Amino acid sequence: MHRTYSLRNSRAPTASQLQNPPPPPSTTFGPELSRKLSQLVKIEKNVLRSMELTANERRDAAKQLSIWGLENDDDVSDITDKLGVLIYEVSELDDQFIDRYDQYRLTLKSIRDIEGSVQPSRDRKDKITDKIAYLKYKDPQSPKIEVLEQELVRAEAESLVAEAQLSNITRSKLRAAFNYQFDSIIEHSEKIALIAGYGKALLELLDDSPVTPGETRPAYDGYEASKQIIIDAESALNEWTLDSAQVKPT
Amino acid sequence: MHRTYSLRNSRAPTASQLQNPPPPPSTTFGPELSRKLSQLVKIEKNVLRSMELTANERRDAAKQLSIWGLENDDDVSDITDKLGVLIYEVSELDDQFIDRYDQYRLTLKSIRDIEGSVQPSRDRKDKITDKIAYLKYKDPQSPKIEVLEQELVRAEAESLVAEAQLSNITRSKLRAAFNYQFDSIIEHSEKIALIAGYGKALLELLDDSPVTPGETRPAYDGYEASKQIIIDAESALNEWTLDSAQVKPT
Amino acid sequence: MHRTYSLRNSRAPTASQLQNPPPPPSTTFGPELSRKLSQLVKIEKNVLRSMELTANERRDAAKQLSIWGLENDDDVSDITDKLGVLIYEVSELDDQFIDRYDQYRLTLKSIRDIEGSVQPSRDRKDKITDKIAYLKYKDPQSPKIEVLEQELVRAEAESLVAEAQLSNITRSKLRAAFNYQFDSIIEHSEKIALIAGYGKALLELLDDSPVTPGETRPAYDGYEASKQIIIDAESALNEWTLDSAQVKPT
């Protein structure tokens, strides 16, 4: 982030910022082992709910735009409806992305559960060690020291296997979960970019030449290109695959 | 110090003073054995707190400089921020030096404790000697004199071993503590000197040619050398080792 | 600083940290134009006072160390005194560094004063512009508009010369002040490093071989090397020059 080599929150200028000045800002108990990882889940759930609300509101706006667009000139009354139809797809994409996000959250919850179950063995080994130390302090001639040592050896073996078992699966699950999340993000971004790029061509057939008072506009006949654009967008959405990613990292 | 061969507090001129005249001055109970060594610890702690306050204030000044530097010409608004970022490292170095100073203070406290524990044996031997002397004065025919002499011999043996044991470890701990402190001082000074030397090159790319009223300055493009200087400084700081000391005593 | 590529305050390991684990943490109105630059001066003054207190406390500790060192073995009673004498030079160096810091602070105060004096012209030009705008709004037929425009042109010329005059000197003073401060820092660090390096050799002639109870140590005769080390340190301090800097940036 821009504060990498700066002490202030101001963003460093870039090529896009140099080309166009930036717009002004907008006017608007539990186990000890599993405690930091058990907090991330709540934040992810909150993100999911907020994103669902955003998608619902965007769908409502897309629905409402065509209602206003109904009572206007013939070309506007069609372009507005088609643009609303095109915008309606963003919520559909957002729903699938939310589902994949929930899958990733469950994958993380699995690791949380396994480490929370692992903790008690390392608790009990320390308890046994404290007990034998206290017994040795109080009176070295007690007979409980031998059995304490034997069960300490047993618990030490169990704890030795437990830590290796936990560390064998933590990274294995983490890598898969993050790869899945990154693939989902890439797919969502590429689909949104494709939708926007295809929708940008809808405005090319909307005339914008100024007219003087007392003149009549020519009849608008663009009911075919508008249908073709939507059909092509649907075909492109149904055709896209992960192996056909246009964005290539350098 | 300059008063070595003088009776006044005035400093003798040197080569640096000959080259440049000196600026004017700025306009702004307990055991008896462990009593002198138990006072040095408090002074060291006071030094530590004062140095921590100095580092905090310097960090605050470095933070505040860029805020003023924000509203100026393009080159100044960048050089000021980079210089503040570079100055921010001095507090980070000071924190580590403070930690090493505390380690040295603890090492000295160990010697204080051991000598304070040693003292009572040499107290009790003198007490026994005074008692036997008084008993011999009062009446030489008392039977307590023999047992007093026997326990005096025992205490004499114990005190003989105690003094040797104390003197065996006092120098051993003192030498190690002072070597550690000197190494810490050398490392801190070398790192500060390296930071200052690398930061002195930041001002070479800041233009200083005078301009007349009614003229416009050329566009400033120095966003690459400024980043390179910071990257090189970070690399040099992460690369420095004790064995690579540039300063060599004669 | 280590948070450059991290989101946490933990310091990234380095070569020195890899070689030796880090010790644990220690157990212990005004013109609008000149307002951000008029705050840095107070922070610099606070830094100066805190550094003066640190130097005073360090001098006190160096004075107190020899008092404890007086009552010990012959070699320790001399090494401690010589080490205190050597440590006494750090406060002397700190005083000169404080003086140079005050010089730099005065240099910055000059810029603060000049910009504070510059501000009123740009205030009065805006006031005149607001007045003529209001007069034009209220009644365009007023005769004051012409004289307002004439004096607006005059004030515009004055303000045009003023901004160029201020910007011609701001960078010129800033660069010189920061170069002076960096040179002072480099000199102070190099002198401290030289003092520490020369003082590290004082402990080589202090014997540390352990002794058993009932034995006597050999007579210590090191009153010549101790004097020679101090004489060499004084000569090196009086000989050092800025052009003879041992530290060379890469």
Side-chain angles (χ1 to χ4, degrees):
Chain A
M1 175 269 164
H2 318 116
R3 91 155 308 143
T4 315
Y5 319 87
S6 161
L7 290 161
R8 48 188 164 221
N9 329 86
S10 95
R11 318 127 189 279
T14 175
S16 171
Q17 267 197 21
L18 252 60
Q19 279 197 359
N20 298 311
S26 155
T27 173
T28 45
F29 209 179
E32 205 289 322
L33 194 37
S34 70
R35 240 181 212 165
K36 294 170 175 192
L37 186 48
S38 171
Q39 187 76 44
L40 196 135
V41 164
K42 256 40 167 146
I43 311 304
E44 297 289 344
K45 186 177 78 166
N46 227 332
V47 165
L48 269 191
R49 319 170 43 91
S50 170
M51 262 165 78
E52 161 176 294
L53 173 61
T54 279
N56 253 5
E57 224 80 5
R58 176 189 271 112
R59 144 165 61 240
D60 204 349
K63 208 54 163 149
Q64 217 284 324
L65 165 77
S66 87
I67 270 177
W68 164 80
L70 189 36
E71 45 218 45
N72 262 244
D73 166 29
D74 286 359
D75 58 43
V76 159
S77 203
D78 192 42
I79 295 317
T80 288
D81 172 39
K82 297 307 171 68
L83 280 169
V85 152
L86 267 197
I87 293 181
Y88 207 76
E89 218 59 48
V90 180
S91 170
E92 311 297 341
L93 304 191
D94 273 15
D95 280 348
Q96 306 156 15
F97 186 72
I98 283 172
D99 290 353
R100 265 159 296 142
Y101 226 60
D102 199 353
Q103 286 303 97
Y104 149 80
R105 209 188 50 121
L106 288 201
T107 308
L108 286 204
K109 196 137 62 169
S110 73
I111 292 183
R112 167 203 84 167
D113 283 358
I114 190 83
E115 92 184 3
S117 88
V118 152
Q119 147 86 331
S121 148
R122 93 164 48 177
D123 185 307
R124 101 158 50 103
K125 178 173 112 47
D126 283 28
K127 155 78 162 308
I128 274 176
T129 302
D130 168 315
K131 205 146 46 167
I132 164 175
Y134 172 56
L135 220 31
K136 188 159 313 184
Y137 150 72
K138 186 51 75 56
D139 46 293
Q141 308 297 337
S142 209
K144 311 197 206 182
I145 288 179
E146 178 53 32
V147 53
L148 280 191
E149 283 173 358
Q150 305 270 248
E151 74 174 325
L152 158 69
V153 166
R154 299 202 323 262
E156 161 295 327
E158 165 205 54
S159 159
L160 175 136
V161 86
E163 301 296 325
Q165 150 171 304
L166 169 148
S167 157
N168 224 50
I169 88 163
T170 281
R171 310 159 308 124
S172 177
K173 254 159 172 27
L174 197 75
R175 147 181 284 215
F178 267 175
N179 264 4
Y180 189 50
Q181 204 256 34
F182 277 177
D183 266 352
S184 182
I185 280 191
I186 276 186
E187 148 161 4
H188 177 45
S189 279
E190 272 208 359
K191 277 196 171 182
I192 291 292
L194 215 78
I195 272 284
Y198 256 39
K200 201 154 170 278
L202 210 47
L203 301 188
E204 207 82 356
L205 57 103
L206 162 74
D207 205 312
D208 215 47
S209 54
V211 85
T212 80
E215 307 188 16
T216 176
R217 333 211 40 210
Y220 153 76
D221 60 332
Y223 289 74
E224 307 289 8
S226 148
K227 200 67 58 66
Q228 210 66 23
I229 286 187
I230 274 188
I231 290 312
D232 278 13
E234 172 142 348
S235 158
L237 252 52
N238 223 65
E239 177 270 337
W240 185 88
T241 57
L242 197 33
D243 308 309
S244 41
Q246 296 94 314
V247 195
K248 279 307 148 52
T250 64
Chain B
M1 175 269 164
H2 318 116
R3 91 155 308 143
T4 315
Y5 319 87
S6 161
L7 290 161
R8 48 188 164 221
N9 329 86
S10 95
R11 318 127 189 279
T14 175
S16 171
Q17 267 197 21
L18 252 60
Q19 279 197 359
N20 298 311
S26 155
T27 173
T28 45
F29 209 179
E32 205 289 322
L33 194 37
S34 70
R35 240 181 212 165
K36 294 170 175 192
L37 186 48
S38 171
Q39 187 76 44
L40 196 135
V41 164
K42 256 40 167 146
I43 311 304
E44 297 289 344
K45 186 177 78 166
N46 227 332
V47 165
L48 269 191
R49 319 170 43 91
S50 170
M51 262 165 78
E52 161 176 294
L53 173 61
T54 279
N56 253 5
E57 224 80 5
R58 176 189 271 112
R59 144 165 61 240
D60 204 349
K63 208 54 163 149
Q64 217 284 324
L65 165 77
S66 87
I67 270 177
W68 164 80
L70 189 36
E71 45 218 45
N72 262 244
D73 166 29
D74 286 359
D75 58 43
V76 159
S77 203
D78 192 42
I79 295 317
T80 288
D81 172 39
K82 297 307 171 68
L83 280 169
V85 152
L86 267 197
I87 293 181
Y88 207 76
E89 218 59 48
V90 180
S91 170
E92 311 297 341
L93 304 191
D94 273 15
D95 280 348
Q96 306 156 15
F97 186 72
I98 283 172
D99 290 353
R100 265 159 296 142
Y101 226 60
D102 199 353
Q103 286 303 97
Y104 149 80
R105 209 188 50 121
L106 288 201
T107 308
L108 286 204
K109 196 137 62 169
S110 73
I111 292 183
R112 167 203 84 167
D113 283 358
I114 190 83
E115 92 184 3
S117 88
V118 152
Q119 147 86 331
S121 148
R122 93 164 48 177
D123 185 307
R124 101 158 50 103
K125 178 173 112 47
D126 283 28
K127 155 78 162 308
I128 274 176
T129 302
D130 168 315
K131 205 146 46 167
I132 164 175
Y134 172 56
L135 220 31
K136 188 159 313 184
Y137 150 72
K138 186 51 75 56
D139 46 293
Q141 308 297 337
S142 209
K144 311 197 206 182
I145 288 179
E146 178 53 32
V147 53
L148 280 191
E149 283 173 358
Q150 305 270 248
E151 74 174 325
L152 158 69
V153 166
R154 299 202 323 262
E156 161 295 327
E158 165 205 54
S159 159
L160 175 136
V161 86
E163 301 296 325
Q165 150 171 304
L166 169 148
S167 157
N168 224 50
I169 88 163
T170 281
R171 310 159 308 124
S172 177
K173 254 159 172 27
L174 197 75
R175 147 181 284 215
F178 267 175
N179 264 4
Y180 189 50
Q181 204 256 34
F182 277 177
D183 266 352
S184 182
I185 280 191
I186 276 186
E187 148 161 4
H188 177 45
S189 279
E190 272 208 359
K191 277 196 171 182
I192 291 292
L194 215 78
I195 272 284
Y198 256 39
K200 201 154 170 278
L202 210 47
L203 301 188
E204 207 82 356
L205 57 103
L206 162 74
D207 205 312
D208 215 47
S209 54
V211 85
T212 80
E215 307 188 16
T216 176
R217 333 211 40 210
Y220 153 76
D221 60 332
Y223 289 74
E224 307 289 8
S226 148
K227 200 67 58 66
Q228 210 66 23
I229 286 187
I230 274 188
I231 290 312
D232 278 13
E234 172 142 348
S235 158
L237 252 52
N238 223 65
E239 177 270 337
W240 185 88
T241 57
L242 197 33
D243 308 309
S244 41
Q246 296 94 314
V247 195
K248 279 307 148 52
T250 64
Chain C
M1 175 269 164
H2 318 116
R3 91 155 308 143
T4 315
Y5 319 87
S6 161
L7 290 161
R8 48 188 164 221
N9 329 86
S10 95
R11 318 127 189 279
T14 175
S16 171
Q17 267 197 21
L18 252 60
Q19 279 197 359
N20 298 311
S26 155
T27 173
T28 45
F29 209 179
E32 205 289 322
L33 194 37
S34 70
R35 240 181 212 165
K36 294 170 175 192
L37 186 48
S38 171
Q39 187 76 44
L40 196 135
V41 164
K42 256 40 167 146
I43 311 304
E44 297 289 344
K45 186 177 78 166
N46 227 332
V47 165
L48 269 191
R49 319 170 43 91
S50 170
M51 262 165 78
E52 161 176 294
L53 173 61
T54 279
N56 253 5
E57 224 80 5
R58 176 189 271 112
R59 144 165 61 240
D60 204 349
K63 208 54 163 149
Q64 217 284 324
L65 165 77
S66 87
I67 270 177
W68 164 80
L70 189 36
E71 45 218 45
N72 262 244
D73 166 29
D74 286 359
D75 58 43
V76 159
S77 203
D78 192 42
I79 295 317
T80 288
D81 172 39
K82 297 307 171 68
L83 280 169
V85 152
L86 267 197
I87 293 181
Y88 207 76
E89 218 59 48
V90 180
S91 170
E92 311 297 341
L93 304 191
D94 273 15
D95 280 348
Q96 306 156 15
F97 186 72
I98 283 172
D99 290 353
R100 265 159 296 142
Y101 226 60
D102 199 353
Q103 286 303 97
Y104 149 80
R105 209 188 50 121
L106 288 201
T107 308
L108 286 204
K109 196 137 62 169
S110 73
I111 292 183
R112 167 203 84 167
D113 283 358
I114 190 83
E115 92 184 3
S117 88
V118 152
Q119 147 86 331
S121 148
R122 93 164 48 177
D123 185 307
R124 101 158 50 103
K125 178 173 112 47
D126 283 28
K127 155 78 162 308
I128 274 176
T129 302
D130 168 315
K131 205 146 46 167
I132 164 175
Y134 172 56
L135 220 31
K136 188 159 313 184
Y137 150 72
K138 186 51 75 56
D139 46 293
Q141 308 297 337
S142 209
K144 311 197 206 182
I145 288 179
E146 178 53 32
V147 53
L148 280 191
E149 283 173 358
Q150 305 270 248
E151 74 174 325
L152 158 69
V153 166
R154 299 202 323 262
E156 161 295 327
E158 165 205 54
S159 159
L160 175 136
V161 86
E163 301 296 325
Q165 150 171 304
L166 169 148
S167 157
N168 224 50
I169 88 163
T170 281
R171 310 159 308 124
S172 177
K173 254 159 172 27
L174 197 75
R175 147 181 284 215
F178 267 175
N179 264 4
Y180 189 50
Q181 204 256 34
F182 277 177
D183 266 352
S184 182
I185 280 191
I186 276 186
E187 148 161 4
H188 177 45
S189 279
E190 272 208 359
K191 277 196 171 182
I192 291 292
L194 215 78
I195 272 284
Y198 256 39
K200 201 154 170 278
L202 210 47
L203 301 188
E204 207 82 356
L205 57 103
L206 162 74
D207 205 312
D208 215 47
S209 54
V211 85
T212 80
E215 307 188 16
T216 176
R217 333 211 40 210
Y220 153 76
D221 60 332
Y223 289 74
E224 307 289 8
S226 148
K227 200 67 58 66
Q228 210 66 23
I229 286 187
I230 274 188
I231 290 312
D232 278 13
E234 172 142 348
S235 158
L237 252 52
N238 223 65
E239 177 270 337
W240 185 88
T241 57
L242 197 33
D243 308 309
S244 41
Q246 296 94 314
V247 195
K248 279 307 148 52
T250 64

